[PDB]
């Protein structure tokens, strides 16, 4: 039985028939290739946003940046990508500097953990110190 690999790492009589000739000459409108490439670009799924979520040992994934600053930084990045995609220097469709006073907006980041505290120091480090405070040794 055929073995299927894993893309993701584990835990480690005359034959001739009358009408079959191929002398038809037709061009499509719209063409097949153009719509095929556009559909290929539309097939792509959305990106995974894991910022602000735990690691496999408890530490938070992301960067130590404020949330509103994070939202504005992401808006700038998306606008630059739009300008790149339409090949212009300045984007016609923009996500920043829109005329809406959207100053309370928040985005995920690595600056907070799940209990609401700050990640000035990783969670595993805090566990280690809180445990080290209670150790005892062999009598002198």
């Amino acid at each position: 039985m055929k073995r299927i690999p894993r893309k993701t790492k584990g835990k480690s009589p005359a034959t001739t028939e009358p009408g079959t000739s191929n002398r038809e000459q037709y061009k499509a409108r719209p063409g097949i290739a153009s719509v095929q490439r556009a559909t290929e670009s539309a097939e792509m799924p959305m990106k995974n946003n894991d910022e602000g979520t735990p690691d496999k040992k408890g530490n938070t994934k992301g960067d130590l940046v404020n949330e509103h600053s994070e939202a504005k930084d992401e808006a700038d990045e998306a606008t630059k990508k739009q300008a790149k995609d339409t090949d212009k220097s300045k984007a016609q469709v923009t996500y920043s500097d829109t005329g809406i006073n959207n100053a309370n907006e928040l985005s995920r980041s690595g600056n907070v953990d799940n209990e609401g505290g700050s990640n000035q120091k990783p969670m595993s480090t805090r566990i280690a110190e809180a445990t080290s405070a209670i150790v005892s040794k062999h009598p002198a």
Binding site: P30, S34, V35, A38, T39, S41, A42
Partner: peptide, 8 residues
């Protein structure tokens, strides 16, 4: 872009 391709 897909709409731009398909529409007449």
């Amino acid at each position: 872009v897909l709409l731009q391709r398909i529409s007449p």
